[PDB]
Structures are given as structure tokens and as C-alpha cells.
From a paper:
[name], a class C orphan [name], functions in cognition, stress-induced mood control, and synaptic development. Among class C GPCRs, [name] is unique as it lacks a Venus flytrap-fold ligand-binding domain and terminates Gαi/o protein signaling through the [name]-Gβ5 heterodimer. Here, we report the cryo-EM structures of [name] alone and in complex with one or two [name]-Gβ5 heterodimers. [name] dimerizes through Per-Arnt-Sim-fold extracellular and transmembrane (TM) domains connected by an epidermal growth factor-like linker.
Cryo-EM analyses for [name] (residues 1–863)–[name]–Gβ5 complex revealed three types of [name] states: apo [name] and the [name]:[name]:Gβ5 complex in a 2:1:1 ratio at an average resolution of 4.3 Å and in a 2:2:2 ratio at 4.7 Å. Since the 2GPR158–[name]–Gβ5 and 2GPR158–2RGS7–2Gβ5 complexes exhibit virtually identical structures, except for an additional [name]–Gβ5 heterodimer in the latter, we focus on describing the overall structure of the 2GPR158-2RGS7-2Gβ5 complex and close-up view of the 2GPR158–[name]–Gβ5 complex. The [name]–Gβ5 heterodimer binds to [name] through the DHEX domain, which is sandwiched between the ICLs and the Ha helix. The disordered ICL2 (10 residues) and the cytoplasmic tip of TM3 in apo [name] becomes ordered upon binding of [name]. Conformation of the three ICLs of [name] bound to the [name] are similar to those of Gi-bound GABAB, mGluR2, and mGluR4. The DHEX domain faces the ICLs, inserting the Xα1 helix and the Xα1Xα2 loop to the inverted V-shaped TM interface. The Xα1 and Xα3 helices of the DHEX domain are packed below the [name] TM (ICL2, ICL3, and TM3), and the Xα3 helix is on top of the Ha helix that is positioned in perpendicular to the TM helices. However, the Xα1Xα2 loop of DHEX is shifted towards TM5 by as much as 6.8 Å, consistent with previous reports that the loop is the most flexible part of the [name] protein47. In all cases, [name]–Gβ5 collides to TM domain of the other protomer. This suggests that the inverted V-shaped TM4/5 arrangement of apo [name] is critical for recruiting [name]–Gβ5, and explains why apo [name] can facilitate noncanonical signaling. The [name]–[name]–Gβ5 structure provide a basis for the selectivity of [name] for RGS proteins: first, only [name] family members contain the DHEX domain, which is responsible for binding [name].
Residue numbers in the entry:
A (entry chain C): 18 to 218, 256 to 450
B (entry chain A): 70 to 180, 189 to 205, 211 to 220, 261 to 292, 296 to 361, 389 to 668, 703 to 763
C (entry chain B): 71 to 180, 189 to 220, 262 to 292, 296 to 360, 390 to 511, 525 to 668
D (entry chain D): 15 to 353
Write the structure that this text describes.
Amino acid sequence: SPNMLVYRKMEDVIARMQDEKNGIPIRTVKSFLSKIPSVFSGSDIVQWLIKNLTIEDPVEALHLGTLMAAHGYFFPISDHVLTLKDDGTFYRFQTPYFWPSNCWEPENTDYAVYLCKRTMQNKARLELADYEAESLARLQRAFARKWEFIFMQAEAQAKVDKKRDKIERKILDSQERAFWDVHRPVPGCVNTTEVDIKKSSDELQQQIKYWQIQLDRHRLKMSKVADSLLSYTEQYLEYDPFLLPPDPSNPWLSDDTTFWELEASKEPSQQRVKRWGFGMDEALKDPVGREQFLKFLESEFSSENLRFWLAVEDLKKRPIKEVPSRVQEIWQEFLAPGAPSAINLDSKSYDKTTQNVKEPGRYTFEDAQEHIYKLMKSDSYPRFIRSSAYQELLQA
Amino acid sequence: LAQKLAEEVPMDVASYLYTGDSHQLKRANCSGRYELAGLPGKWPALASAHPSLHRALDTLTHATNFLNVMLQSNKSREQNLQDDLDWYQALVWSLLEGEPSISRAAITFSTQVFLQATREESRILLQDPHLANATLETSHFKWSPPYLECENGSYKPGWLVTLSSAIYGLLVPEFRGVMKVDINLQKVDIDQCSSDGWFSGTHKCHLNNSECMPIKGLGFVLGAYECICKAGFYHPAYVCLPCREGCPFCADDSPCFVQEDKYLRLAIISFQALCMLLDFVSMLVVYHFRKAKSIRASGLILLETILFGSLLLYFPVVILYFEPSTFRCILLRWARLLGFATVYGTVTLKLHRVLKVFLSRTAQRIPYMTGGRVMRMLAVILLVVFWFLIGWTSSVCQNLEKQISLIGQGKTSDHLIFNMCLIDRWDYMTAVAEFLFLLWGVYLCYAVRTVPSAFHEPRYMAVAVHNELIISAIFHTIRFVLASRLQSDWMLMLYFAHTHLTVTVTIGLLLIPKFSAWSEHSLDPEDIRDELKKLYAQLEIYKRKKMITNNPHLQKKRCSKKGLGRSIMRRITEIPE
Amino acid sequence: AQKLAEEVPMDVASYLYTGDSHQLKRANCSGRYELAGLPGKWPALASAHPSLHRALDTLTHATNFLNVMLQSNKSREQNLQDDLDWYQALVWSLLEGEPSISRAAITFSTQVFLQATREESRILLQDLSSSAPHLANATLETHFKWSPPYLECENGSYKPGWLVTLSSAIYGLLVPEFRGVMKVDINLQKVDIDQCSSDGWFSGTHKCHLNNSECMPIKGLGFVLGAYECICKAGFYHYVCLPCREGCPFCADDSPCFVQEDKYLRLAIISFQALCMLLDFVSMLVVYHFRKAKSIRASGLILLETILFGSLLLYFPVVILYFEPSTFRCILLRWARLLGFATVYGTVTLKLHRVLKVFLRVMRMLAVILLVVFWFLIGWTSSVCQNLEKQISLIGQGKTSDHLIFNMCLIDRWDYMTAVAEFLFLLWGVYLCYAVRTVPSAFHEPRYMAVAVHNELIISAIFHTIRFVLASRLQSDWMLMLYFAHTHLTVTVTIGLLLIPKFS
Amino acid sequence: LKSEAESLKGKLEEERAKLHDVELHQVAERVEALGQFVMKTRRTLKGHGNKVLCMDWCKDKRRIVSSSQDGKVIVWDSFTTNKEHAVTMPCTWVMACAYAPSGCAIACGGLDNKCSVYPLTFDKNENMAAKKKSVAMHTNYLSACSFTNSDMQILTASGDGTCALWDVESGQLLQSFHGHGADVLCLDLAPSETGNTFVSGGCDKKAMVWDMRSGQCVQAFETHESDINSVRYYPSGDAFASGSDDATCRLYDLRADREVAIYSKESIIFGASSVDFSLSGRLLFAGYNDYTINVWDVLKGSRVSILFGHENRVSTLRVSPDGTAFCSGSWDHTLRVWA
């Protein structure tokens, strides 16, 4: 179960927190009104975080502390809503029987028990806040039968704990107050219990063959990948609109629209034209690049292979209703010998084509597309980038 | 005013001579001499009014006794030509050389042999009447009251006398002469408004609210006094103008008072009345709308209680429009505190019921708290507050009602008046109680913050609570700094605020919406044995509950018991593994 | 000075101090008195009866008369024909003018002179030197001549009357000179005098200076001493003016104005009170030792020590009201009363409430009512101190029953309704115990407490009654017995019912 | 015979020593290292109502296709974010979609065992699903498709462990592959138009490549630590790498037949749920489970970024073919267009 590991890590945290030799010291304050022992101030825990965790931002360490304290690992002695506030207020750890890691789950009758007990310990005031008084009103109206032993065991517990010493009753009641704060919190702050429903739950011959495919699994050195990754970063590094934007106009930040609108304009910018020059794949991604490359191929009387590859791609878009209607037709137009558009195949290519053409398939012309595609990538794109039209358009 | 009525027959520049100095009065005169108003004087010319009067009186009577023993002397050769003339002249001259009131005089006898002696400047102008006729008719100084001179026009003198006895010769003694002198009492200050004296009365000062003040100035004339009016402004004759109210010390008979609006207060009252009426009619509504969804969720009588109580809490602001007195501030505190508890208190306790029904219901629906329970934990509070009011109300009504203190009482802004009710430490403690009470309510509406409940009443209630606490703190703090800077208006603003605010609020919020070791081995074994003991204890309690949980069916109990036993034995055998 | 100046005239001190017939009816004088220093500083008719003014008036009249008459030109010295008759009639009218001008002479020589003295009704008169005529002292002067009081004697017994004289030297007539001397003498013996006057005839108030002193003198009789009565101002009177024994006027005696004490009684009273409070503390320690068998659980150690701290908080009022009433006393009294009251009886009744629920959260009921009582002390305390410590009413009062006085702490309507609190807060528990009537345990604890409650209701009601009824006619001893008695009764009782059984 | 088999294996070891004398990156360090990236979001899509679990570009270089787990397929325009289609699938867990070359049809299916295809165009304004014409159908849940460049023949993979080509209108099966024994999850065309081949690997921890001209399992490899969840060709048509829920991505040659270099980092621990290259062939992409993305250098082996965008987990990921950007699939209920 996932969150179990999370709670385990934070358990590591608090275990290092109340360390014998290091740790925060749980002090005993003396006041003009009273003498309160076994507390400490939130500035202490803030300092402890910053020391032993090296959390550079005070705010960051404070937010870590915030959610920790909203998972019941320490609470403010005079408040319902768990929030760590860096100041002189008094805190306390929680008990190993009342962590939240212990799969606990209170229920409505037990909330009624704690309500009767708190309301009946003191009888000097309605020692409570308006939300908890509201909850008790509902519990009354709906629990008409079962009240009595609730009251019974409540005052029983009151005697069984008051019989022990006066500071004991105080600390135990403080703890077993806060632990019900965290498991039924004030209307505002988020519950920290819930979870998402998603987590709501020959033999050696194939073995040996896996070993052999790992052998023939061609790999390259990490330095090679390093160069590839750095270089693919660099070639658009000057295009990153987060780090160093080529144009600081940001429709988000600087309330402009012109950047995208220039992007909509079919006329390519000089960034655009320099960016075409990296790879014809990116070109074909560009509609503008498709148009200009196709123009050159036409004016050079060489506008067929691109026509084919566009044909393959535009075929790979329609549903299964038209796959046969196109495959036979595209064969008869390009891959049927005797048609004007003469795609050119070798032995195994045309063999594969002839065998598959009976059956229209989502991966029909893979090897032929590879063949013509390596052809175009090897020949066309180079001369295009080398071409006068490319140079004249990249100049301005 | 017989005097002015008497001297209303003045002859020539009389008050110009009698109220004013008689210079032009004597420079403007055409008559005979010696106008004696003898006896018209207050009393007569037979009284005692002055030191120099009694000086001359002593001179008078001692001359008289001297004569009555001297003219009765022996060896009375009567050498009226040899040297007895030296004796007589030395006598009459030296007397005014000794006496101070020395204008003119005579001694005319034959015992006319007249030493008619008048101190011209320092030489007694000596030379040789009806008064003599009267002496012959009748011993005593025949003195008149104020008589003028004889300038051959009235007389160029003010007050003066005519005091005269006889040089009675001597088979007994007999009147044979007339010694006399006319001293001018024109140099004698006088008092119209006197108690006793020359025309001692009060001319035009009604002394019911006037006070004369006779004085000493120039001397013998009318106007020789000063009147005052008493406790009122002199209408200006000087005559009292008691202030607009009893604001004493009447400089100008003007007000001390910030007199205050009509077209504020009319609308205040009409408005507040309409809100009171809304409350009443809400009560009538729910009396008609006794069937619903939520009135059963929130009991009828609680709501009538609330609404009534707060209706009553609207009294502070019909109160003040009437004048402050004893009765006012007292009823204020009655109404306030009644309203306060019987609104916010019951609300808070409703919420307490919420909490308890919750647990009650979580454990065994058996109607833990009911609407029958609320009123009891209401009456407690109602009582307490009654005893308190009786305390305060007693202190007043038995000690400081009449004896020493009061409430109807005013202070001043800069120099102007304002009355009101007022405070002491009690209202302070009152406030602090309200504060704490709702504090408890707020803790309640703090913890109770999480229920699954129908209409979220908690929102509504709890916000009324918080609102009220705030508004009350502020109100009381202001009014309990501001004892001194508060006319009626500014206050009435403040009470209007507090009341419509919290009353309307905590009517509405509730009522209206109801139509809309950190280780692994150790901790591992620890949590493990914990769960284990929990299981085994659950099992033992299950064994006891076999008959104790008689609440349901047997086979159903049978199935439950069987499943529990099976899973428990499974967990045991797993713990053993 | 004045005192040493009294040893002046022997066989005259009766005529001086007594102003008596011992120096007059039988005492050989052979000489007239002389006030040339026996008067005041000189009074000179600046400290004057009017009669001085009358005398000087007639004097000056006659003086001007004879002066201007002798100033008549060509002074003839014609004493032959009738001028003697003029002078004789003149002196006759002269002495006839004054009813107390006893004798008077008039000499004119620019040795023989005219004289006359009042025999019975006529001027016994003769052309011979008599009355007064001091040509010798006039030559010594070479204004009028003041004179001295006298006595009717030159070589005889001083007869009735002391003679103060007025005298003058007849200025002659184009220059002046001494040409005569005329003088009379009037009885300066029926002449009221003033020892206590601000200024008068040598006024010395040497009988009542300060010691509750007032001089309420004998105003007008005549020239007599011992005529300045004094008053003893607000104290005792045994020539003795004395203070009171205390600030307590009407001291016809210098007796005391307070109650008789019974100190010896009070010592043992207080000792026994300490006895009970000792038992309180002691038993708290007893508790905190022997805390481990049945009583500990059924009856909270805490709640016991609550009650004992109550009793120890409580017993104070006694030790208070031995001491004197200051106002700061009374307030502690209210403090201790209500605090011990609530702090005990709250825990008591709450135990029963808890019992009643077992039939069918303690301190969060108790601290409430402790709160309310705190509040109350504060409120009332401030309302008396801040606003009645000074202004209007007095609390510590010196109240009198019949002859004596006594201090005490006084009351107010407040503590009436406070007592009523006691009534009701018990009556709750009474309902409680009554209907909870048959309810078990091995103790009859409920019977014990219910007994306490019936006890305290009736009896603490009575104590508050018999204090509030007649406090205004209490001594400061009968009261103390009251406090002692009722608090020992009810509260030692209400200790013992709880504590007694929990040993045996 | 056993000794001879092992000796042929030792000879393969010898030839592998001669070829790999210097390691890929041991020579790769020579190329100059690479600089900074600034990529981040440039769009967002907000239409789904669930997780999203598949996506694909057109050849028009601007549109969008992505299906969900609920039942609702979408057709966006990320350049415009304006829907021009919509469609509802009858079932759940639609786990794979695909776009026509010209733009005529899309195949979506999984867990219903039948892969429907709809005519993409603006032909019938009534529905994009109403013209559902069953074309393939296995007997189990269906993992993915690759219209293999004619627009009339689509691949598919289920839990059967066996794939095939299925015509468009007919349902007429054309050839079969049964070399497996588990659930396969991966499928991609070759870039070359030389020999129309393709790969399939899966739960068995292995990868195997079919030659469609026959149907015979010519090449076969196994190194993963768990189930695998996708793979893609090196875009020169010469090799292919991948990643899974080990979090340990690897790259494999065709000409040397050997692993070339490990792609892992201890930091990231979560599962790896897609990969795709950049038009240069320089970078590497992968969506993960810890919610990030992770671009890695293909030569020097370092990371270059982590671009945190997704609240949940990364489902699957692609590069637009023009070479200008990339999108992500994720558990966050929306998509982004990461430039």
C-alpha cells in the first residue's frame, strides 16, 4: 500500500526528531499564571528542520513542517486546527498508539462518546466550539436509542483517569483530544486522511533467446547519449521560451498576441527557416516546410516520392471503413506496375507489397515507406538545404 | 406725618430755612420779627434733649436760687445807684463771659431799670412785653420753642429760646423784674425720623420694611436723617422691591435664575409618554399573541415582567419636570432600582437556565429548570433591594427629614442660582453594585457562546448587557463629578439619554426579532493501560446497569449487552496477546 | 502696692475697710483724713459722679461773678456800707445751693473772712474765717485747687462725714494777684465707690481674679469698702471660688458626675471572655490534629475552622465595651458582629442545603454573602464618617440617667433592620430543618443544627430587643452583662453542639 | 545453462561499463549552469465545484480541457477565463480527459469502464454530452487516453492490465496488449511520427513499451519502489523519465537501455503525481504530494525553484505544446496557469 511508505518515511523523520542526544528539548514553561511543563515553541522546530534538513527556504521548511503537523505528529496546545506557526506557542508530539499510521478509523458512536465526556468533565462552560456543538446536536437527534452506556463509560473513564495524578489527566486528555482533531477536522482545513479510489484496491530456449536478444540489443555509450541530449537541447536551447526566449514577447506574461499570430502567418520567420535546416522530419512536421519543399520538388520535376509518403501518412489517418478503398487504389496508382506514379521497389519490398495488398492493413506499406523514406532523407533534404531558395528565404 | 402736615404752613422759604440753610430764606424776607413757633416743637419747650441745654439749665436754676436767696437777703439797703449796679452788670455780663450759649439777654427790674445786655461781639451791649405781662399774671423760665430772629423780616435765626425768670423783690417776696435770655438752638442737629425728639417720627419711610438712620451733619434742618428700605431694591423713592423670588439681597429687582424652555420640555414629556405607552401596548399584544413558536421558547411571564418593570424605569424623566422636593428624589431611587433588577436580573437568570437545560438535556431530558424556577430566584433579589430602600429611606424619614438636612437644594454656576436633588455616598455604592451584578451576567454570556440554539437569543441579550454596563458607567461618572455645573436642562439631557438608550435597546433587541512522560514505551503502555482500564470499568458499570438501565427493552438490552460483552472480551484477549 | 498701702491709718481701717463705727463712734482721731493718694491716681473728676460737675458749675459761676465784679474799674475796697451784706448773702445762697456742702468760707484781702456751715436748715454764718480759705496754698501756687477727703476732726473724734474740698484763689484786679481764697467742703463719705471698676476710685478686684472669677460688685451704697461681691463661675464655692470636679457644671459640691464602677467584677468578666476565645483557638488546633475518622468527611475540617474563626472574629464586642466609647469603637462593633454572624451561619445552612440535595459548590454560595456584608460596612461607614463625623450628629454620647453621667456607643435605625436580617437568614434554615424531618445519618446532625437555629432566632432576637428598647436609660454595667450573657449562651452553645460528639 | 545466462548478464555488465565509462552528469557538469527564474501565477480558474483530476491542452495553444470527479467536464479559455462549453458526465471519478488535435472531440472516462467521446464543436447548442457515442469500453475503471494523432483512434488503459486502440464511430477494437498483470496507469504517444509506439507501466513496479505495429512487448524496465503514476517521453523521441509515490523520479534511455540518473531529494518525501518536459527539453516538471511543484535541471540535478501555490495536493500537470507555460492539476478545487 503506497501511503504506508510515506508515513514510514515521516516516522523516520520524527524518530530522528525526538532523538536522545540530539533533538528538540521538551521544556517546562513557568508563567505568572501557571507552570506548564513538556512543551516547546514552533521556532524551535523550525530551527530543528533548518539545521538537520538544510531546507534553504524558511518558507519551504515551514511548508514541510505544516503538512507534517497536519498529519498528527505535533499540534498547537490551544487550537483545534493543526497549523505550525513559527512563533512562541506550545506544541507536543503524539503517542505511538495514536499515530495515523495505525489504520485507525473512528465512528459516529465514538464521536458521541468523546462529546459526552468533554462536555461532562468540567461543567463550568460549554467547553467546545460551535462546529463540535453542532455535531453533538445531530448525534443526539439521530442516536435516540443508544446514549446511556456512552455517558456511563465516559464518566467512568473520567474517574479512571482523574484518579491518576493531575498532570497525567492533563497530558492524556490533551493528546486524546488532538488525535480526534486530526481525524475529524474543522470545516475549513483539508482532511489529511483520504485516499484516491485508484489506490482503493524449450523453456530455457525462450530464456536463452531472451539472453541472445539482449546480446544483439545494440547499445551505445552514455557519453554518446550525453552528446545527443546536450546537442538536442542546444539546437533549441535558444528556442526555450522559459530559459532564454528568442523573442521576449510572451502572450502570457507581456499581454501580447503577436508571437502566436506570427506563428499563424504562413511566411516563415528566420528562426523558422534556421529550424527547418535541422531535419526534414521537422520540415514535414511544419506545414510551411511541406509546402516549400513540395514547391522545390515540383519545379525540379521531382515531386513524387514526397507525394507518396504524404499519401501513406494521409492513409494512416482514416478509419477501417476506407482502408481497403484506398489500399487497392493506391496500389493501382503508385504500386501497380504500369501506373504513372512509379514507386520503385526491390525484391523483398515488392514481394511484401504484393502479399499484403490483398489485405488492407494499418501497417500496410512499412518496408516500402522505409525504403523511400531513407531515400528522401538521404538525398532530397540535403540539396534542399543547399538550395538557393532556402538560402534566399533564410536571409530574410 | 403731622410734622410736615404741621409745617406745611411755612411762611417764607421755610424748608429753605427749615430743611435747607436759611441764607436766601433770610435774604428773601419781608415781615416783622421774632416768629416763635413756641410749643409746635415735638413735646414743648419743657423737655430735655441736649448737653448744652442742661448746661444753661444749671446756669438758669442756680442763678434763680441765687436770686431767691439774694433778693431775700438781710440789710437790703437797695443801693441801686451806689454800687449795686456794678454787682448787677458784672453778674449779667460775666454770666455770658462764663456761659457759651451767649446771644442776648436782659435783666429789667425795679427792686425799667434794665441791664439789657447782649454779647454783640465781646462787649455786652447794655441798655435800659407780653412776657412781663405773663410774669405779672402768674417762678419759671418762660422759654419758647424754636423762634427766629427779629431782623424786621421773620428772623435771621433758626431755633432759639426765650428763657426768662423774674428779679422778684421783697410781707412776703414779690415779682419786681424780668431776667431773660434767648440762646439760639439754630446750631442744633435734628431728626425727622427719630424715636423721640423734635418731630421724632418717620416722614415717608414705611418702617414695616424700612429702617431710618438719623445722622449728624450741617445741623438744625429737616432732611437731617437717612432712610433705608429693607430686603428689597429701592424703587429708583427708596422703597423695597423684593427679588423675583426669595433670592435675597436685592440690588436690582432682577432674577438670579436661568429660566428654561417650553418647546424643549413639552416634547420631552410627550415623547417619553409615547414610549411608555408602547410598553403598555406590548403587554396587550402578548396578551393577544399567547400562541407562537418562540414565546414557548421564551416564557410569556418573563416578558411581561421585563416590559412592566422597564415601563416603570421610564419614571426619572417625568419626574424632573415637576419641581424637586423631598418626595421626588426618594421615588426616583425606588423606581430606578426596582426597574433595574426586574429587568437586567431576570434576563441574566434566563441565560443561566439556558446553560442548565443544556446539560440536563444532554444527560436525561427531565426538565431540569423550568419557568416555574425563575420567579423564585427573582423574589430573593426583590427582597434584598426592599430592605435596602428601607435603610436609606429610614435614615431620611426618621433623622434628617426636618431636623438638620434636606435635598431640595441649589448651588450656583458663576453667580446664578439653580436648585435640584443631590447626592451622598449611597448613590456611589449603588452604582458599584450595578456594575458588579452585570459583570456576573457578562461571564455568563461569555461561556455561553457555542450552543446550537434556535433564534440566537444569546447575541441579542449579551449585547444589551454590554451596552448597558458601558452607558451606565459613563452616566454615573459624569453626574457624580458634576454636582456643581448642572442646571435642570443639561441634566435632563443626561437622564433622557440614559433612559431612551437602554430602555429602547433592551426592549428591542429581544422583543422585535421575534416577529421576523512524553515518551514511547512509557506513554505507549500508559495510553494502552488507560484504554484497558476504561474498557474494564465500562464493563463493570455495564454489569451493574443490567437492571439499572431498565429504561428500554430486554432483548434490545440483551443485544446491547451481548455485543458489548463480545467486543470487550475480544479487546481483552487482544490486550493479552 | 494697694495691699501694702492698707497699713496706712490706725483706728481708721474700720472707717477705711469696714467703713464702720469702730473707727467712728469710738475712736480718737484728732485729725482730718486726707485723700492725696488715698484716692485713685488722681480722678480729678475724670472718674466723676455728676455731682462733681454740679459743684464745679456753681463754683465757676460764682468765680466769674466775683472776678468780673472785682475787675470792675476803680476797686474801692468799699467793705463799709453794704458790700459785707453782698458777700454774706452770696455765701448764704452758696452753701444753700448744695444740700451736701457742709461748710464753706470766702476770704478776700487784696485773715478775716466770711464763713457758713449748715446747722439744720439755715446757713450758720458769721464774718469769720471758716469752711475753707487757703491763702497759704494760694501763695504757694504764687486754675482752682482740688482737695482731699477728710474727717470731721482736727483735735477731736472724727464725727460723721468725710470732707472733700473744692478751693480757689481769688485773682485780684491792670494786673492780677492773690486777693482772696474761697472754698467749700462736702461729705465725701456717702459716696459710692468701685473696687472692681475698669477705672474708678482705686479699683482693685483683689477677691476674684481668674479662678472661676467674676466680680458682681455692690454698686451704690456710699464710701464703703467690701462692696464688690464676686461670683464663682461654674465650679465650687468652698472667699472661695473653685473649679468643678470635671467638665460638669452645677458644682454646688465638688462631687463627681459619673457612675460608680465595679472594676473587680470587670476583670473576671474579661478573663472569662478570653477563656471562651481561648477555647475557640484551641479547638481549631484540636481539629487540625485529629482529622482522620468519621467527623472529617461528614463535617469539613475547612468548615469547622470557618466556624471557629467566626467565633474568634465574634467575641470582641465584650472587650470593646469594657473600654471607653470613642466613635472608632462603635464601628468595630458593627464589623465584628455582622462578619462573625454571616461567616458562621452561612456555612451552617449550606451544609443543610447540601443534605437536602443528597435527599434527591459551597464556597461559590458563601463568598457571595461575605461580599454583600463587605459592601455594607463600606457604605454605612463612609456615610457616617465622611458626612456625619463632623457636620450634624455625634455618636459617642455623654447621656445622663439621674444625677450621674455615662458614655456609650449609640445606635441607628440601620442596626434595627440588621437584626431583622438575623431573624430571616435563620428562619430559612428553620423551614429547612422542619420539613427535613426524618432524614437519616448516624449523627442526628440535623437535629443538632436545627436546635442551634431555633435557639439563636429566639434569643438573639431578644438580645437585640433588650438593647434597643431602653438603651437611653442604661448604666454602663447592666449592658455589659447583657452582651456577655447572650453571646456566651448562644454561641458557646452553637460551638458545643458541633464539637462535643466528635471525640466520643 | 544458468551459468551461461549469468555470463551473458556479466557480458551485459561489461558492455555497460564500456558504454557508461563516464556518467551522464559526470560529463554534464561541463555545460554552463543555469540562472534565476521568476515564474509565478498569471491566471486562475474558478469554475469547478470539487477536486480537479485531469487536464490537457489543445493544439491551438490557448484553450483548456479539464474534467472533475463530480461529473462535470469543462472547456475554458485561460487567455479569457470565459466558458464556451460545458458538459456533464453520467458517472463519478472522471479520471482522464483528452483533446482532439484539430479540436473535434474529447474522451472522458474511468470507473464506468466505458470511454465516451463528444464532438467538441459548436454543433448542437443543446448539450455537449447528448451526442454520447460509446466508443471504447473495458470492464474496469479507465486510466487515460492519447488520441494518437489522427483524431479517429484513441488509446485507453484500465485496471485490466491491458490496453488497445479503439476506433471513433465503430467501437471496433483494433489490437490488444496483454503483457501485464496489474493496474496500468500511464500512456503517452511518442513524439516521432516514425513508429507509432507508446509506453504502459503500472502497479507491477515496472514499465513496458508496446510497439503498436504488432502488439508485442519489445522493451521492459523495473526499478520503482511502488506503483507508478505517470510517464512522458524525452521530447526528442529518444528516452523517457518519470516519478511515482517513491518520490524518487528517474530517467531512462532507449538506446543504452539503462537508468541515466536518479532524481530524488530527502526533503520532498511525498508522492510524485505527474511529469512533463519543457519544449527545450531542458527543465523537468513534476507536481508532487507535498503541495509544491518542483522544477529540476535535467543535467546538473539541482532544484531550481519551489513555487508554492496549491492549498492541497497536485493531481496532474502538463506543458503547453507551443512551449510557453504550464498548468497544474491539484486538490484545491481550481486551476492556475503557471508561467
